[PDB]
Design a protein around this ligand. Structure first.
Ligand SMILES: [Cl-]
Ligand SMILES: [Cl-]
Ligand SMILES: [Cl-]
Ligand SMILES: [Cl-]
Ligand SMILES: [Cl-]
Ligand SMILES: [Cl-]
Length: 128
């Protein structure tokens, strides 16, 4: 059983690994984080920063969520992330992923007390 904040950490936090993800990173991480259980999660972003730095985004720039609902926030700084995208050829339970490391501002939806990330909304290159 899992809280929204915990699900966010499981799906999106990778604090203790290198930023420049190897080509196998997504294959391994999507498996290890249970995102290939039941189905291949089609796309997923991991954030290679300290948990506190990501949580602090909840107190940074308030921006509109992609679906116009909830409370989203954009990081002041560009963060190390990795996008994982399910390969066209993959079919569950064979879940293969292309790994794309980049540095981007993250946009997360925050909620609760404490007020913490519960949804990875988007990433964008530009500051402001
Ligand atoms: Cl950084
Ligand atoms: Cl990508
Ligand atoms: Cl792509
Ligand atoms: Cl999410
Ligand atoms: Cl972008
Ligand atoms: Cl883009």
């Amino acid at each position: 059983k899992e809280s929204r904040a915990k699900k966010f950490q499981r799906q999106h936090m990778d604090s203790d690994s290198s930023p420049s993800s190897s080509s196998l990173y997504c294959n391994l991480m999507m498996l290890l984080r249970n995102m290939t259980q039941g189905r291949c999660k089609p796309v997923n972003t991991f954030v290679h920063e300290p948990l506190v730095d990501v949580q602090n985004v909840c107190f940074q720039e308030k921006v509109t969520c992609k679906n116009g609902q909830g409370n989203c926030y954009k990081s002041n700084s560009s963060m190390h992330i990795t996008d994982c995208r399910l390969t066209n050829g993959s079919r569950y339970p064979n879940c293969a992923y292309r790994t794309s490391p980049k540095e981007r501002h993250i946009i997360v939806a925050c909620e609760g007390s404490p007020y913490v990330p519960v949804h990875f909304d988007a990433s964008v290159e530009d500051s402001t």
